């Protein structure tokens, strides 16, 4: 009679990372892609022979930068003149070029110059996470749910639709990320009355905060607020400069203009600095790191709090910012959500639920696959076709 319809998914698509899950009986299963990773890094790399995406582009970037291509996000639906464009531009190592005041990426590919549309790079990230999808279901997908942020307009949100039909899906609907947050935790289904929720997203390279009003399953954004300069790679950044000064005391040598040191010692930061999330110590071993020293060193929880304490108490200022703009009070907030693999930090969940006197934090879902987790839960109710019955 009828046959059985593939599953929908849910991707969330990252500006660092991204992250896909599906909905099956009666819960999400967010699924690893083919090294075992929960979430795919948004790079695409090209070179003479191959077109790498994910842990693959990633995983060669030191040594092919003008070639690799990460944060197709802060692009799309953007023009090459907008201010936000021309800041971050100097900060990229590959060329971002104006085609009718449409920025595009310029790189080396099989021989030949090739300019990319943002859209087109994000359709080959969109290409991994439905691959990732079929490996695990063993049958071609075709629907999907994208989020973006609540911030993206309306060319921001068509250009994202773009992209998801070059990679050959149907879009059932593209949804904010904090109302996907939401959505993973059933806020939309707790009855009726009304609900303040606020969604706290600390990202690689930005901080987002959300107050949404929930009645009857009906989300509203009423207010938004964050910092583009504060996120993961800046607590990064402090440990690195710790490192570097610690090497100098310890040997009377200077690190800092040796590329490969540099970048062994901000990789095994980044590591020290997830270790830190769970553990109240952590050790630091490289081998070789300069002129054949050994660097073998250790970081207390304690000395990277005091080393990014600024930083930490900034995401309040937002958080307040979003308070007023909403004409509500801290009091007033129904629900505390975390988004991010930076609020699995002690001390960032600490300052915040010290600011809203004790509450309890949801942080149940992974912070870095909440969004791709609601994003599944909306696609799943999306294809339903009942008929009512007599
Ligand atoms: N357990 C964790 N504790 C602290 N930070 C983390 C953790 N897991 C992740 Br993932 N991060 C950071 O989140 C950002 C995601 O773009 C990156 O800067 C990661 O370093
Ligand atoms: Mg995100």
């Known amino acids: 009679?009828?046959?059985?319809?593939?599953?929908?998914?849910?991707?969330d698509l990252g500006t660092?990372?991204?992250?896909?899950?599906?909905?099956?009986?009666?819960?999400?299963?967010?699924?690893?892609?083919?090294?075992?990773?929960?979430?795919?890094?948004?790079?695409?790399?090209?070179?003479?022979?191959?077109?790498?995406?994910?842990?693959?582009?990633?995983?060669?970037?030191?040594?092919?930068?003008?070639?690799?291509?990460?944060?197709?996000?802060?692009?799309?639906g953007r023009k090459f003149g907008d201010p936000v464009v021309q800041s971050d531009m100097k900060h990229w190592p590959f060329q971002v070029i104006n085609d009718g005041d449409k920025p595009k990426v310029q790189v080396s590919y099989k021989g030949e110059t090739?300019?990319?549309?943002?859209?087109?790079?994000?359709?080959?990230?969109?290409?991994?996470?439905?691959?990732?999808?079929?490996?695990?279901?063993?049958?071609?997908?075709?629907?999907?749910?994208?989020t973006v942020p609540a911030y993206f307009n309306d060319s921001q949100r068509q250009a994202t639709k773009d992209a998801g039909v070059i990679a050959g899906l149907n879009v059932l609907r593209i949804i904010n990320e904090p109302t996907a947050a939401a959505i993973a935790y059933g806020l939309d289904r707790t009855g009726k009355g009304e609900r303040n929720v606020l969604i706290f997203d600390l990202g690689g390279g930005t901080f987002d905060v959300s107050i949404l009003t929930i009645d009857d399953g009906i989300f509203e954004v009423?207010?938004?607020?964050?910092?583009?300069?504060?996120?993961?790679?800046?607590?990064?950044?402090?440990?690195?400069?710790?490192?570097?000064?610690?090497?100098?005391?310890?040997h009377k040598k200077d690190i800092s203009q040796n590329k490969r040191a540099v970048?062994?010692?901000?990789?095994?930061?980044?590591?020290?600095?997830?270790?830190?999330?769970?553990?109240?110590?952590?050790?630091?071993?490289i081998d070789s790191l300069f002129e054949?020293?050994?660097?073998?060193?250790?970081?207390?929880?304690?000395?990277?709090?005091?080393?990014?304490?600024?930083?930490?108490?900034?995401?309040?200022?937002?958080?307040?910012?979003?308070?007023?703009?909403?004409?509500?009070?801290?009091a007033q907030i129904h629900d505390?959500?975390?988004?991010?693999?930076?609020?699995?930090?002690?001390?960032?969940?600490?300052?915040?639920?010290?600011?809203?006197?004790?509450?309890?934090?949801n942080k149940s879902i992974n912070p870095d696959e909440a969004v791709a987790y609601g994003a599944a839960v909306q696609a799943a109710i999306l294809i339903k076709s009942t008929r009512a019955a007599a």
């Open 114 to 146: 090739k300019a990319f549309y943002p859209e087109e790079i994000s359709s080959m990230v969109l290409t991994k996470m439905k691959e990732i999808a079929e490996a695990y279901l063993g049958y071609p997908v075709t629907n999907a749910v994208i």
């Open 222 to 250: 009423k207010a938004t607020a964050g910092d583009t300069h504060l996120g993961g790679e800046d607590f990064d950044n402090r440990l690195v400069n710790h490192f570097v000064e610690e090497f100098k005391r310890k």
């Open 292 to 330: 054949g020293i050994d660097f073998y060193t250790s970081i207390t929880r304690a000395r990277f709090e005091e080393l990014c304490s600024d930083l930490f108490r900034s995401t309040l200022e937002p958080v307040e910012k979003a308070l007023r703009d909403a004409k509500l009070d801290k």
């Open 336 to 361: 505390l959500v975390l988004v991010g693999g930076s609020t699995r930090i002690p001390k960032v969940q600490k300052l915040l639920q010290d600011f809203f006197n004790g509450r309890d934090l």
């Open 1 to 11: 009679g009828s046959m059985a319809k593939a599953a929908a998914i849910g991707i």
């Open 16 to 76: 660092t990372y991204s992250c896909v899950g599906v909905f099956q009986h009666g819960k999400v299963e967010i699924i690893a892609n083919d090294q075992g990773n929960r979430t795919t890094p948004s790079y695409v790399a090209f070179t003479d022979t191959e077109r790498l995406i994910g842990d693959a582009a990633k995983n060669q970037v030191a040594l092919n930068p003008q070639n690799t291509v990460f944060d197709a996000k802060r692009l799309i």
């Open 263 to 285: 970048r062994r010692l901000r990789t095994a930061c980044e590591r020290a600095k997830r270790t830190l999330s769970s553990s109240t110590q952590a050790s630091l071993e």
